[PDB]
């Protein structure tokens, strides 16, 4: 492990987390519209 890789991995997990948050939220809005 090195600092260049460290920065990149941090960015990779971060950008993933955000995309995952929006995913769960996406389905939740989808399901809310389903059950109205």
């Amino acid at each position: 492990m090195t600092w260049e890789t460290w920065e990149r991995e941090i960015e990779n997990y971060t950008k993933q987390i955000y995309k995952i948050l929006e995913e769960s939220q996406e389905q939740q809005d989808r399901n809310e519209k389903d059950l109205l």
Binding site: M1, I10, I17, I20, S24
Partner: protein, 41 residues
């Protein structure tokens, strides 16, 4: 399922946390090396 998702988000943040721990340990060792270098003078 949404529970599984939240669970994976937490898992991902856990990996992030592990990386920050690695970084902190690296810095602690490097600061300690500098402190020792100066004390040894």
């Amino acid at each position: 399922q949404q529970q599984n998702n939240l669970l994976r988000a937490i898992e991902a943040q856990q990996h992030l946390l592990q990386l920050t721990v690695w970084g902190i340990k690296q810095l602690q060792a490097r600061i300690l090396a500098v402190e020792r270098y100066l004390k040894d003078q």
